[PDB]
Each structure stands twice: as structure tokens, then as C-alpha cells.
């Protein structure tokens, strides 16, 4: 009986108050930690760097003047969301920039952390490796093993609708003509 | 490696955001909700409290309920973590018999009741058949040689009905019969070490296969336990109805043991200690949709005033109905097997009423049926949803309806002859029709009612193929139907319970004269 | 870090002394040290407690559980705060009786939980039997019931139990003895065995309002007439119409919260009859009749100078006590309870407490306590009684009357008037100090004709289901409407409060309302109807 009190006690009793804004800085830094460091060095080497804004991501100097048309974004689950409400956007161009909206709830929950990691993977595949065309036959070979397999819902998890309708196995030509779909997977 | 404060198997993050268990070929594992891969597979999206070993507060942990490690008798719909699982026992009286310390033996029908400031206690209500099985048995006071200084004996048969969602095991509830406002005739003993059987939800004790439990012991406990002076018998004759109030002292609880998967009744935990918590932290919803019987369910809602209590996931009314009763959205429109949500009334207690008027104000809406998916449930509200089409009495039992609805339900004459009708009507209507008045009409407007006595209406039986058959020869003179003119109209009237007479009038009139009758049939003599 | 915690109550030492609060973060609850600027706007309460007491109140729920909510969900809200003792207070309410001889006088009764003066920690109530004549011809009870000098009457009543405390009782139900007069104990109502398996949450009845009340007479074979009563007793009863119901404090076991599975189980070792003594010797007692003129009792944890461990409790100032125990608040910084300023209430103190407060008023050089309210320290064992200043009270601190001016003001809203009666809408509280009305008619030249001219014929005021009071003339009339000899004749109506009522015929059996002090309540001419 005396044993259980401690565990509940520790989780609930925050000894000191970090502060109103410190928590924000500490949350974002912990999140990016989990991604292997070597990825960050590749990003910096190719140019632009991530800056964390605090307010409505919809209105920032770096992003206000560019890509106004692309207000339609698709989350990891494929449902459409308006940019203003959304909490993280990225843009591919001469100055690769990634912007994340600061919040205090990245450690506690996970649905928000998943989108940030999701955006890091899109920058990595489309902007980094693409300079070397690193996704190739090995990635294509695993890819092919997923499509033809016993009732594997795996397809449903990673493929969009466009993919579920290619009748035969994947071909090295297809990746060249269409490279946004594969990079997404 | 993963924080889990409530110590209930499921990690924190999963519980707050939404999760679901899905069996991968033969192994069950818990997974975070993925919108696209679980939804097409027909899995339900769960939510729960990271700080409650049982969000509902009933004796089964959040983890056990959804995984199935649980007494296999809790009804399926209560496996979802936000629906309290507990028993609800009421008493059903099938038939009685009377005599003097010449036996009036009538069949009775009981319905679980609910009246109005309505409180958390189960009670039922029996209605004794009034129709005259014997022609010559006018006035019971004489059919039984009852004198001013006599006493009658009461001997009934009862069975127990469990309409809740969890099993009771050892005990069986004590229950007291009461006639009128406060004259308690008898308290039904709690038989001892005799309910060794089980009451699973939606089951009877004793089963439909056994003789029902004789109420009088037949032993020496009391010679005539249900004694009854003259005056009660008089009052009983004027009202022809009784109440059966039962309390909630059930047995122990069956818990699941992880070490070997055996379900054993622990003698420490007793339903009489749990029920108060459930009754104070959940919203209560009453629904009479399925078969016109009052089904009660409890859903876990947040209570602003209490820190620990704010942890439970918010429940919007629409969401409650989806998981508690079976409503669904084929085309995004709420309906229960076809009947859209719009065919039901919403009634609320004064507290809940006040709360909902606020909710309708910050949304600037007047029709609740629209902003329905935006209504927050708070703890302790009581909501009663009844079909808008039927009339109801003081104890919220279905008693009548508007005539217009009644007629279309009969506009389908499967067959007609000179011996009766064989209809096929929707099973729900025949619980608000007491009987039928048959009459013949002279070519010049006369009116001859065959069964012209108040207590001679029960002439409509039901055949074994669900086709209703009305028999004229029952309360006739065992003779076929005569018709004085192939041009004479044949009129048939039906009398709903609410519109029925139960005793002879002021001057002891027995004719169906002053009875409001609704026309249900009228065909030509030649056609019949 | 090994944050220190001697009291072993979950909250660390420093936090309890200085101030903390629990606040739900989206779905996770965490405990935090009080920050003055960021918590106040959120409407969170600043808690304090004792670093050396597992339960500052001394009742069976630890400092941590009360504020966190891990507790029997039945404990009343106001008791969740760590400085308010949570315990049961059971008294008996008797609704109606019936009498006969071993033609049954069945009268409805009204009961109020009482408290009198040197007042001690034991609950008692007091029933008052209606005196009005339900039957016209039933003058003199002595004859309506065939009572002879050598006879004995039988008593058969119905009772219900009321829990006005703040915590549930579980298994047992208390024994309680009825007593007439000063010391004549007529009967002790048995403690039924293994039958109160239900729960009495605060402000609930047992059995509930929807079921038949527990019959006092067993109706079995235990005693043919348990309530025997010689003739002389019946005489006192005829003169007084008062009975007392004394109840003891033997409650059941206690419900504790289990951390392992969140189960609330009734432990058979701990029993309220062991805890109450602790609470009653370490708390200040505050009695309040504000809400509906009923006596609500609360206990607040105060310091006791003589005892080391007891100086540990946070200092409690009177003003804050009223705020957290009952619901007082500060719309404009003025203490008030739903409109009524704190100034409309009396403060009465026991001789000890009185003396103690006189000292407190001296080191501050003040004379009006209503000002220095936020500077009065409470110590253990003081007893304070806060009663409405506008109503008159009897010896047992029951509401019994009021100043005439209040009575008139309560009637200045005539919603309707006709020749069949009045339909008023009066504040629900006043109609608990009015026994009845005297109706009279006045000739244009000053004559006076009183319609219901009998002492025992006053209960003529019923209440409609929409809370509108309706006075019926035909009740104690001749079932006939009201006649008026002149459309210019004024109709005067007087009201008689309980305190000013007569309960028995006089020396020479006078039934007229002559020597009764009556307050005028209405006066409209015959044409103004």
C-alpha cells in the first residue's frame, strides 16, 4: 500500500514551476532530439534552417509572400485541413525552409509529434536524397514485396488511392515519371 | 519506457487520444488509432481516462473491458469503456388467484414503470386482466362469497427479469408488494441459498422452461401471508392495478483473475457499494424505442467541479446514442433501423433543462435536432427520449395514440371472410389496443353491437404465424355471422387502453355507449 | 532529490505550508505550487494545509484525496476542501401519527431539527402536531377518542431519516428514543437489524420520497402496543402537542479509497464511532440558518495554542471560513450571501467563545465586529451561531415569528383579488412563520364580522402547484361564496404568526380570536375587489 503512493505521487507533484515560456522552448528541443543527428547536419549543409514561430503560422514574413495558392494540405491520414488552423508547414525551393509552431504539448500527446516527424521525412526524401536520387531499386524492391502479399493491410497503411490501382508490379520507369507518390510512401 | 499513472495496462498517451485492439492473425495487441486502416475493418474508436482504473466506475478495468478478459456475460454493448455495466432487477407478475380465507383466476401483464423529480430506484406495475372469461361472473364480490367481515387470500406467481447489463450471482432482491398509496400488503421473502442460478442480462429466473416461483411458500411461515380485510378489496376493485417496489441489494461481484483466467466471485466486493458511485458520476438515458419497454443505460460524463473527474473524455449527445444503443449513420442521418432521430421527443428534468437552455444559447439555435452533435453532456443529467407518435400516461407507459396512425396500420387486409380478419400488423402497435367493438348497420342507419358489454371486448387472438385473427364466436353465442342485407354496412371499432372503461358506470351501465370508439373497418355486406 | 515529506501524505512539506493547487492539464492532472499571477485569472482556489497531519480535518480522508477527487464520490462538494471536516449528521423526521385505544385520530405533523442553548454535541429534533380541526364535529380530542381515566392509547407513527451532514453512512442505522414532556420516555424505536443496506448521501432521505415511510409500530408480534401510555401522559400531550426525538451517534463503518484498483470498499475495521470524538475536540463549530431557515452545521479546523501538533494547522480567519464553508462571495468586496449582506445576520457566542472574542476585539481597538471581520482568529472549540436578524426565535432556536413591518412588506404585491380568494406570490421563506389568517367583514359604519370565528379553524391557506398561494374562503365557510352587504364595505384580513398563536382553548374554553395580537394584512372596499 505504501509502495503505490510513490509512483502516483511523483507523476503528479511537479516540484518547481519551469515558467510560462520556458516550457515552450524545452518542448520543441526535446522533440527534435529523437531524430538522428546526422539528418540535421544534412539539412544545414543544403542550406536553409528551421525556425520556430509562436503565433498563427499562416502569417509570417518568410511564408506570407510565397505559395498563397497552396492553402490545401493533407495530413498524414489524408484528410484535408486549412493551413491557418494547421500547426506546421514546409516549403521546397531555392531556400529550403521548415517552420514549426511552438506548443507545450509535444511530449505529452503524440498526434502532434507525428506530423512534425512526418514533415522531416518529406524534406529528407524530396529535398535531400533527391540531390543524389538515393531512393532506388532497394527501396523499390521492398516496395514491390508489399504490393504482392497475402491480404496485407500494409498497403492500406502506406499507399494512397493512386497506387492501389496499378495492376502489375512496380517498374523502374514509373518512379522516374512519377516521383511525388513514391517519395510520400 | 511509457508512463502509465492509472496502472491499468494501457499507457497514458493511448488512453487520452484514442486506441483500439485488433487481432493480428492469432495474437491480440493494443494499437494507436489509425484513421484509414482500422475504420474500414469495422473497429470502434475508444477513449478513456488516464487516471481512472475504470472510467465508468464499474468493477471492470478499462483494459479488461475492451480486450474481452471479463465475465463473458456482460452484454456486448457494455463492453465499451464509457457505458456503466450494472444489474437492474425488476419483478414481473404473470397471474394471480383469489379466494376466501369461487376463485377469480385472471392473467396479468406487467411493465417496468417510471414516473415524474424522478429517482434512481426500480419499480414495476402490474395490470390485471379485466375481461370476463365467464359470462355469468358479473361482480367478483359475489362470485367469491365475500362478506363484510370476511378476508381474501392472495396467491400469485412471479419471475425475475434482468434488463441491465451485468450478472448477479448469489443474492436475489427483496421486494415488497403495495396496493394503493401506502397499504403494504406483503413483503416477498428473500429466499435463502436458493438463487444458485445466474441472471444474465435479458434473461429470466426461473427460466421460461420452468414453473414460475409460487409466491406463497406453501409451508407454515404464514397461514395466509397475504391476508386482506374487506375495505382493501373494495379499493382494489375500483383501481384494478398494483405496484411492485424492489430495492437494489444484489449479491457479490464476479471478477477476472489474471493468473489463470478463472472468474471467481470475490466475497469482499458487493454491488451495494459500487452503485452509489455510478449513480453520481454518469448521465442517465431512457429509451423506449426497441419494443416500447423502458431501457436504461448510463454513460460516463465529465463533472466540471471535480479535478479527477474532468479527466474523462467529453461525450456529445450524438456520440452517446451511437455507442449505447446502436444508432448509426448510413447517410450521416441518425436513425435506429430506419426511423430517423426526428421521430422522437426529448424531455428533461428541471436541472438538466436549465443546463441545456444555456447550451442552446451559446450556439444560437432553436431546433436541437440540428446542433445535436454540439451538445455537451455533464454529470447527473437525466434524459428521456420517447417516440413522439404515441400517447403516454402518468407513469410514462405507452397507453394510446392518435387515431390517424392507427388506421394506416390496418389498411392492409390480408384476408376477410364472414368469420374474421387475419391481418399482419407491425408488432409494436398491438400494445396499445385493448379490444374491438363489432357492430352491424341497418340499410337505414341503425346500429347493432354484437358484444355489447364493457367487459366483453377480448375477442382478438393471435395466430401462430403472427397473423392477428379476430374471433366472433368467442364472446358470441357460438354461432356464425348473419347479415340482413348485402347492402348493409359492417362497421368494426377498436378501443385503445387509454380510452377504455374498467368498471360499470354511475348507474351500472354495461353498454359501450359512452365509450369513445375509433372506426377501423367498414366493408359492404356482399364483399364479406 | 528525496523531497521531504514527514506526514507521508503525498504532498511535500513546503507545498502544504505555503499554498498549492491542483489543475487539470488537458487530460492529465498535476499538482503545482501556487503562482499568484497566472492562477488567479483561472478561478482556482488556493489551498493550504498541515505538513504534519495525514488529515488536517482529522476525518478519514487524507489531504491529498480531498483536493484531487480520489474519494467517495458522495462526499458533498463543500467538504472537498481540506479544512472542512466531512462526517455524518443523522436526525429523524416524523411525518404523521395516528392514535386509538388498545375513530382513529390521524393528524399530519411537521418537524424541524432543533438546537437549544450551553449547547452540546448531540442531535435532536422536535415535532409539532397540527392543531387545526380537520373535522368540524371533532371538538375536544378527549372525546373523539374514547379515552377513560383507566384506559391506554396506542401510538402508531411513520418516520423518515434525514442526513444533513456531509458524508455517507453505510451499514447500521442509529437508535433513537422518543420522549414526551421533560423526562417521560415513552419508547425507544428498535434498531432494525441488517436492513439499512442502502446509503444515505448528504441531503437525501431513507427511505426515499418515492416509497412508503418506515412504519414506527412494527405491525408484527414484538409488542402488542409498544407505545403504552397511562392517562396522565395523554393529558400533557393534550396541553403541549410536543414530542422530542433524541438520537445517538452510533453510525456504521467508513468507505475508503483503494489505490490499487480505484475501488471504494467498506472496511470493517474503521468505524465512525471512533473518529467523531477527534473532530469534535479540534474544530470550530459554525451553525447557520441562512438558506431555508434550517440549521446547517459545519466544522472548520482551527489552531489550539496548548498543543504543539495543533499549532501546525494553517491559521483560519473567520471571513475566509464563511467563504469556503457555505458559499459566501465578494461581488464588490462586501461579504454577502445571495444579495443579503453579511450585516443582516446576528452573531451569538457561547460564554467561553464570547469571552475569547472580547479579548480579540481589545487588541485591535474596534467595537463593530462587522468591520474587523477579516482579523478574527478562530481557535479550536469555539461555537458560533449565525441567525437571520429579522425573524423572532424561540428557546430552541427555531424560527417562530417576525416584526410586523416585515410581515406587511411581504404582502405589498397583490397579484389578484376577487370574491373567491387571493392568489399571491410570496417569498418561500416567510410562509414558515405564518400560522393562518383571520377573515372579517366591516360594515360601512365600523362593525366587524369575523367569518372563521373559532380558535381551531385557521388552516385555510393552501398552496398551488405553481407556488402561488391561494386562500380559499369556502373551506371553513359553508361551502358558499363570499357575500358583501355593501360594495363600499372594507374587507380586512389579519395574519397570525405561530408565536402569537393559541394551542388550546382558554380557561373558560374560549374559542374566539379576541386576546390574540393580530396584524392587519389587507383592506379593500367592497367595490375594489
From Swiss-Prot, chain A:
Stated consequence of mutating residue 120 to A: Loss of ability to bind to PA
Localisation per UniProt entry: Secreted; Host cytoplasm, Host cytosol
Phenotype upon changing residue 157 to A: No effect on PA-binding ability and fully toxic
Induction per the UniProt record: Positively transcriptionally regulated by AtxA, which, in turn, is induced by bicarbonate and high temperatures (37 degrees Celsius).
Impact upon substituting residue 119 to A: No effect on PA-binding ability
Domain of life per record: Bacteria
Result for mutant: residue 118 to A: Loss of ability to bind to PA
Effect of residue 116 to A: No effect on PA-binding ability
Effect of residue 121 to A: No effect on PA-binding ability
Free-text function comment from the UniProt entry: Lethal factor (LF), which constitutes one of the three proteins composing the anthrax toxin, is able to trigger rapid cell death in macrophages. Acts as a protease that cleaves the N-terminal of most dual specificity mitogen-activated protein kinase kinases (MAPKKs or MAP2Ks) (except for MAP2K5): cleavage invariably occurs within the N-terminal proline-rich region preceding the kinase domain, thus disrupting a sequence involved in directing specific protein-protein interactions necessary for the assembly of signaling complexes.
Subunit annotation: Interacts (via ATLF domain 1) with the cleaved form of protective antigen (PA-63) anthrax toxin; interaction is required for LF translocation into the host cytoplasm. Interacts with PA-63 homooligomers (either homoheptamers or homooctamers): three molecules of LF bind the PA-63 homoheptamer to form the PA(7)LF(3) complex, in which the relative position of the N-terminal alpha-helices in the three LFs determines which factor is translocated first.
Domain notes: Lethal factor (LF) is composed of four domains: domain I contains the first ATLF domain that binds the membrane-translocating component protective antigen (PA); domains II, III and IV together create a long deep groove that holds the 16-residue N-terminal tail of MAPKK before cleavage. Domain IV contains the catalytic center.
Protein name: Lethal factor
Organism, as annotated: Bacillus anthracis
Amino acid at each position: 500500500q505504501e509502495e503505490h503512493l510513490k509512483e502516483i505521487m511523483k507523476h503528479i507533484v511537479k516540484i518547481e514551476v519551469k515558467g510560462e515560456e520556458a516550457v515552450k522552448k524545452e518542448a520543441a528541443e526535446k522533440l527534435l532530439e529523437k531524430v538522428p543527428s546526422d539528418v540535421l547536419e544534412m539539412y544545414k549543409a543544403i542550406g536553409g534552417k528551421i525556425y520556430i514561430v509562436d503565433g498563427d503560422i499562416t502569417k509570417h514574413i518568410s511564408l506570407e509572400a510565397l505559395s498563397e495558392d497552396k492553402k490545401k494540405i493533407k495530413d498524414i491520414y489524408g484528410k484535408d485541413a486549412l493551413l491557418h488552423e494547421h500547426y506546421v508547414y514546409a516549403k521546397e525551393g531555392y531556400e529550403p525552409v521548415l517552420v514549426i509552431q511552438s506548443s507545450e504539448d509535444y511530449v505529452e500527446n503524440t498526434e502532434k509529434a507525428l506530423n512534425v516527424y512526418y514533415e522531416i521525412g518529406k524534406i529528407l526524401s524530396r529535398d535531400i536524397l533527391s540531390k543524389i536520387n538515393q531512393p532506388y531499386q532497394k527501396f523499390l524492391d521492398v516496395l514491390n514485396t508489399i504490393k504482392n502479399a497475402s491480404d496485407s493491410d500494409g498497403q492500406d497503411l502506406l499507399f494512397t488511392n493512386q497506387l492501389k490501382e496499378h495492376p502489375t508490379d512496380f517498374s523502374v520507369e514509373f518512379l522516374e515519371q512519377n516521383s511525388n507518390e513514391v517519395q510520400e510512401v | 519506457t511509457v508512463p502509465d499513472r492509472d496502472n491499468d495496462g494501457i499507457p497514458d498517451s493511448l488512453e487520452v487520444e484514442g486506441y483500439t485492439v485488433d487481432v493480428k492473425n492469432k495474437r491480440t495487441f493494443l494499437s494507436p488509432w489509425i484513421s484509414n486502416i482500422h475504420e474500414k475493418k469495422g473497429l470502434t474508436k475508444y477513449k478513456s481516462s488516464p487516471e481512472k482504473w475504470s472510467t465508468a466506475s464499474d468493477p471492470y478495468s478499462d483494459f479488461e473491458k475492451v480486450t474481452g478478459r471479463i465475465d463473458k456475460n456482460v452484454s456486448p454493448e457494455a463492453r465499451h469503456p464509457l457505458v456503466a455495466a450494472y444489474p437492474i432487477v425488476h419483478v414481473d407478475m404473470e397471474n394471480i388467484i383469489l379466494s376466501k380465507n369461487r376463485t377469480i383466476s385472471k392473467n396479468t401483464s406487467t411493465s417496468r414503470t417510471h414516473t415524474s423529480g424522478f429517482s434512481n430506484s426500480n419499480s414495476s406495475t402490474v395490470a390485471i386482466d379485466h375481461s370476463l372469461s365467464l359470462a355469468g361472473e358479473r361482480t367478483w364480490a359475489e362470485t367469491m362469497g365475500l362478506n363484510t367481515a370476511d378476508t381474501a387470500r392472495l396467491n400469485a406467481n412471479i419471475r425475475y427479469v434482468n434488463t441491465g447489463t451485468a450478472p448477479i450471482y448469489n443474492v436475489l432482491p427483496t421486494t415488497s408488494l403495495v396496493l394503493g398509496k401506502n397499504q403494504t400488503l406483503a413483503t416477498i421473502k428473500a429466499k435463502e441459498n436458493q438463487l444458485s442460478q445466474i441472471l444474465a442480462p435479458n434473461n429470466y429466473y426461473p427460466s421460461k422452461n420452468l414453473a414460475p416461483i409460487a409466491l406463497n411458500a406453501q409451508d407454515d411461515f404464514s397461514s395466509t401471508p397475504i391476508t386482506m380485510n374487506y375495505n382493501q378489496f373494495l379499493e382494489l376493485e375500483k383501481t384494478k392495478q398494483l405496484r411492485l417496489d424492489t430495492d437494489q441489494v444484489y449479491g457479490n461481484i464476479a471478477t477476472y483473475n489474471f493468473e489463470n483466467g478463472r472468474v471467481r466471485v470475490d466475497t469482499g466486493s458487493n454491488w451495494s457499494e459500487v452503485l452509489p458511485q455510478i449513480q453520481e458520476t454518469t448521465a442517465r438515458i431512457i429509451f423506449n424505442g426497441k419494443d416500447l419497454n423502458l431501457v436504461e443505460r448510463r454513460i460516463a460524463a465529465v463533472n466540471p467541479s471535480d479535478p479527477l473527474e474532468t479527466t474523462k473524455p467529453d461525450m456529445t449527445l450524438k456520440e452517446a446514442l451511437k455507442i449505447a444503443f446502436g444508432f448509426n449513420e448510413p447517410n450521416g442521418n441518425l436513425q435506429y433501423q430506419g426511423k430517423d432521430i426526428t421521430e422522437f421527443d426529448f424531455n428533461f428534468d428541471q436541472q438538466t433543462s436549465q443546463n441545456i437552455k444555456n447550451q442552446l444559447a451559446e450556439l444560437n439555435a432553436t431546433n436541437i435536432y440540428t446542433v445535436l452533435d454540439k451538445i455537451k453532456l455533464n454529470a447527473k443529467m437525466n434524459i428521456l427520449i420517447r417516440d413522439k407518435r404515441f400517447h403516454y400516461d402518468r407513469n410514462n407507459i405507452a397507453v394510446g395514440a392518435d387515431e390517424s396512425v392507427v388506421k394506416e396500420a390496418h389498411r392492409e387486409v390480408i384476408n376477410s371472410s364472414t368469420e374474421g380478419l387475419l391481418l399482419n400488423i407491425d408488432k409494436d402497435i398491438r400494445k396499445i389496443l385493448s379490444g374491438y367493438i363489432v357492430e352491424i348497420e341497418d340499410t337505414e342507419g341503425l346500429k347493432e353491437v354484437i358484444n355489447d358489454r364493457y367487459d366483453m371486448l377480448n375477442i382478438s387472438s393471435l395466430r401462430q404465424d403472427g397473423k392477428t385473427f379476430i374471433d366472433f364466436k368467442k364472446y358470441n353465442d357460438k354461432l356464425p355471422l348473419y347479415i340482413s342485407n348485402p347492402n348493409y354496412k359492417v362497421n368494426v371499432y377498436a378501443v385503445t387502453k387509454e380510452n377504455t372503461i374498467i368498471n360499470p358506470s354511475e348507474n351500472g351501465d354495461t353498454s359501450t355507449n359512452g365509450i369513445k370508439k375509433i372506426l377501423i373497418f367498414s366493408k359492404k355486406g356482399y364483399e364479406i
